[PDB]
Design a protein around this ligand. Structure first.
Ligand SMILES: [Mg+2]
Lengths: 54, 82, 268, 97
RNA sequence: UAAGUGAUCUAGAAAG
RNA sequence: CAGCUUUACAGAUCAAUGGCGGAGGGAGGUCAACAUCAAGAACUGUGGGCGCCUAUAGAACUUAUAACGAACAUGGUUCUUGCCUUUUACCAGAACCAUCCGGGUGUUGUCUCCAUAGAAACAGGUAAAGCUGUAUUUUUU
């Protein structure tokens, strides 16, 4: 009866997961929408030199 | 409750006209009213039965001595009636 | 939703989903891996359906039955469902024999269970003549399935088998379509349906045998049944193109077909 | 894929695509408490290793105080307060060499 | 003083 | 216990004006035919002002974690994948598309089951239902 129970088990959430090729571990998984074009090329953005991991 | 009173209250803000039992007409911005027609006005003229006008700032008027109150035609349109 | 209200439009028994809710929920903990997998599969099935909305016909009021009714050749009765099933089995059987005989192959004999197989060992010419394809076989499979459910109900009606037993039998049929009779052989997207059924069984059985132990006798055939019905929907169209086409051919068999070079073969 | 780590897709793979998180991972994470020893050792190895302004500040404070006093008690004219303040400053200077 | 929770693809029939 | 509006009532003169008026069914069918249900949050006309404003109005249905389905199949086409190496039959994603199993709403038409009156208000009563009421400075003592 609690609607808030379905947090990250919404249809919307599922769709998002599918899009992002990201399994909510309980929920389903699919072929990714987009092929993971791993072509970052060691840029100055999103580097492990730059970001923090708290 | 009195519907004319209600109307008067609604007219609050507007440039109302106001004659007394004495016959001295006023015309100006309505400030406040009560159950008994205890009117107040602002920036108000005052003409006697003779016709000589006299300007004045803040006037209060008692409903007993008031004869009738002219409201603008806008309040005919809406909305306290139905 | 279901009970919140106290007035509603009626949905078809098909259009109710009693399994759905469980699989939508987060799974109950301390379940086996297989059950979890099944749940996941179910979710995936649901999600895909949700995602791609197949919005229906604006135009078509004229359903198949209505058209038939509009003729003089059909008339209508009220019949016991078992009787109807029996009729279907018989009629269906007749159809498959009749068609087969027309085709000329009289040596492929139909069981009354719809398992077709050959009388002699066929010479090669005969074999060539008498290879039925993906339409006819599919139809046969469908008929077999019908017989199986109808057969179980017949049995129940007769003193042969209890109500509970009948229910269980039905459930078994619906889950075991895959093993019970080859549809999947001929059309291997029935595989999806089979998988779904399996998943349902896994879910349903785990729900149903919680405090109670492992064994046969779980009824609750509904979701499986629903799944099969929905599968059949898809087939209706495909079969109507396929089977219908075949019958047309049998009556009036093609003049001048055009091959197509978009094929890998023959292109060069 | 879960936390950027699962195998992208179950197909192709030719495998379950199941993902046990390792218990070597934990070990790898942890030895800054338990590597830690090495660090400690290193630490051990390298373990052993104005007045005028103040005066000025004080003077300033004194001046401020004087000004305040003047403001409080009979010093609407500037010359008086300024004079007194100047005197105070001079005194301060004398005091500090 | 704090380890050890969960992610589990598949899945057959014809003809050649 | 007063007042006005409506039914149930006699016998009226019956003008006056209203309102119920070319005054005549209802309940329903696993019954039809048609219309119409994905669009600028989106409806339809009507005149007037001159393809667009301003008043009229009407409006049944479906929609905000967006849809006719608290429901879910299958095709076809390309592209990418996967098992694979021939194809069908398939894997799973995408984009367009279709088919299907269904759903309403409205209007008719039918089918079935129950039924049958062509005229009543005014002067006000009798009875019952809807709302209002309970002289000493601003309303009428
Ligand atoms: Mg060859």
């Amino acid at each position: 009866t609690d609607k808030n129970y379905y947090y990250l088990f919404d249809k919307k959430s599922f769709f998002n997961g599918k899009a992002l090729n990201n399994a909510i571990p309980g929920g389903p998984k699919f072929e990714p929408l987009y092929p993971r074009e791993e072509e970052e090329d060691y840029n100055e953005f999103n580097s492990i030199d730059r970001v923090i991991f708290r | 409750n009195g519907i004319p009173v209600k109307l008067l209250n609604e007219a609050q803000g507007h440039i109302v006209s106001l004659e007394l039992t004495t016959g001295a007409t006023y015309r100006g911005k309505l400030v406040e009213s009560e159950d008994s027609m205890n009117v107040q006005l602002r920036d108000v003229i005052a003409t006697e039965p003779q016709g000589a006008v006299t300007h004045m700032d803040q006037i209060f008027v008692r409903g007993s001595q008031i004869k009738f109150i002219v409201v603008p035609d806008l309040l005919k349109n809406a909305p306290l009636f139905k | 939703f279901p009970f919140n209200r106290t007035k509603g439009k009626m949905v078809r028994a098909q259009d109710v989903a009693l399994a759905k809710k469980w699989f939508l929920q987060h799974p109950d903990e301390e379940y086996p891996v297989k059950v979890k997998v099944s749940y996941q599969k179910l979710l995936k099935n649901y999600v895909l359906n949700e995602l791609h909305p197949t919005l229906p016909t604006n135009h078509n009021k004229t359903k198949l039955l209505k058209s038939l009714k509009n003729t003089k050749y059909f008339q209508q009765t009220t019949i016991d469902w078992v009787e109807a099933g029996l009729q279907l089995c018989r009629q269906g059987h007749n159809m498959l024999n009749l068609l087969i005989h027309r085709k000329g192959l009289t040596y492929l004999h139909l069981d009354y269970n719809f398992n077709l197989k050959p009388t002699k060992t066929l010479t090669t010419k005969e074999r060539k003549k008498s290879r039925l394809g993906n339409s006819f076989h599919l139809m046969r499979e469908l008929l077999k399935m019908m017989k199986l459910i109808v057969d179980t109900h017949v049995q129940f009606r007769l003193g042969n088998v209890d109500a509970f037993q009948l229910a269980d039998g039905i459930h078994y049929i619906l889950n075991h379509i895959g093993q019970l009779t080859g549809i999947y052989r001929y059309k291997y997207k029935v595989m999806h349906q089979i998988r779904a059924c399996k998943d349902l069984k896994h879910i349903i059985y785990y729900k149903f045998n919680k405090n109670l132990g492992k064994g046969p006798g779980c009824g609750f055939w509904q979701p499986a049944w629903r799944v099969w019905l929905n599968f059949l929907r898809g087939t209706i169209p495909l079969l109507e193109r396929y089977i219908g086409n075949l019958i047309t051919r049998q009556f009036e068999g093609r003049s001048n077909e055009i091959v197509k070079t978009t094929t890998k073969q023959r292109l060069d | 894929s879960y936390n950027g780590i699962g195998l992208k897709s179950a197909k192709g793979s030719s495998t379950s695509g199941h993902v046990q998180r390792s218990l070597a991972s934990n070990n790898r994470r942890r030895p800054q408490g338990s590597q830690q020893q090495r660090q400690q050792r290193q630490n051990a190895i390298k373990k052993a290793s104005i007045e005028t302004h103040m005066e000025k500040r004080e003077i300033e404070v004194q001046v401020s105080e004087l000004r305040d006093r003047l403001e409080e008690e009979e010093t609407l004219s500037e010359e008086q307060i300024d004079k007194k303040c100047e005197a105070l400053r001079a005194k301060l200077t004398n005091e500090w060499q």
